[PDB]
């Protein structure tokens, strides 16, 4: 299958998770494309892809604010071509906050509104990929099986 992975990462934790995810799905016999949302042109970005995974950390002093490289892409979800495609979200976050990885539910809702199907429950964890390999491995499992 063809899998597209796009992320927005400020310190590198959501990046780390998106690279591990690329490795695990690619290992399953699938073609993975990895993009930093800061580099990606949204226009028809999903065309060709059987699933699309979105990674994005949560910030904001008060309410939830998305990582800014993702956000800019989030604005353009309308042109991506998500209708009838499979999608899932992941993120790095901090339990010590009220809205743990709040970007994840947010992505899932925008995606469903645009006609996407949610493949697996959003991955929510702390630190980089090495900090919770199980959580990463399992989320990749969930994804693989829906492909
Ligand atoms: C000011 C600020 C606000 C944050 N807010 C949240 C949040 O609300 N939810 C959450 O899970 N993590 C929150 N975090 C933790 C970061 O999301 C996480 O440590 C960081 O984004 C690592 O991901 P990244 O390196 O891929 O950017 C916050 C961090 C900073 C310092």
Curated annotation (Swiss-Prot):
Keywords: Electron transport, Flavoprotein, FMN, Transport. SUPFAM superfamilies: Flavoproteins. GO terms for molecular function: electron transfer activity; FMN binding. InterPro entries: Flav_short, Flavodoxin, Flavodoxin/NO_synth, Flavodoxin_CS, Flavoprotein-like_sf. Low-potential electron donor to a number of redox enzymes. Belongs to the flavodoxin family. This is Flavodoxin. It comes from Desulfovibrio desulfuricans.
């Amino acid at each position: 299958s063809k899998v597209l992975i796009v992320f927005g990462s400020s310190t590198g934790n959501t990046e780390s998770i998106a690279q591990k995810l690329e490795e695990l799905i690619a290992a399953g016999g699938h073609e993975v494309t990895l993009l930093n949302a800061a580099d990606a042109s949204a226009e028809n970005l999903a065309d060709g892809y059987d699933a699309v995974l979105f990674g994005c950390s949560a910030w904001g002093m008060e309410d939830l604010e998305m990582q800014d490289d993702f956000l800019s892409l989030f604005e353009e979800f309308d042109r991506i071509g998500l209708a009838g495609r499979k999608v899932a979200a992941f993120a790095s976050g901090d339990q010590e906050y009220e809205h743990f990885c709040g970007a994840v539910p947010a992505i899932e809702e925008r995606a469903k509104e645009l006609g996407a199907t949610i493949i697996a429950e959003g991955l929510k964890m702390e630190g980089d990929a090495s900090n919770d390999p199980e959580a990463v491995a399992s989320f990749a499992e969930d994804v693989l099986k829906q492909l």
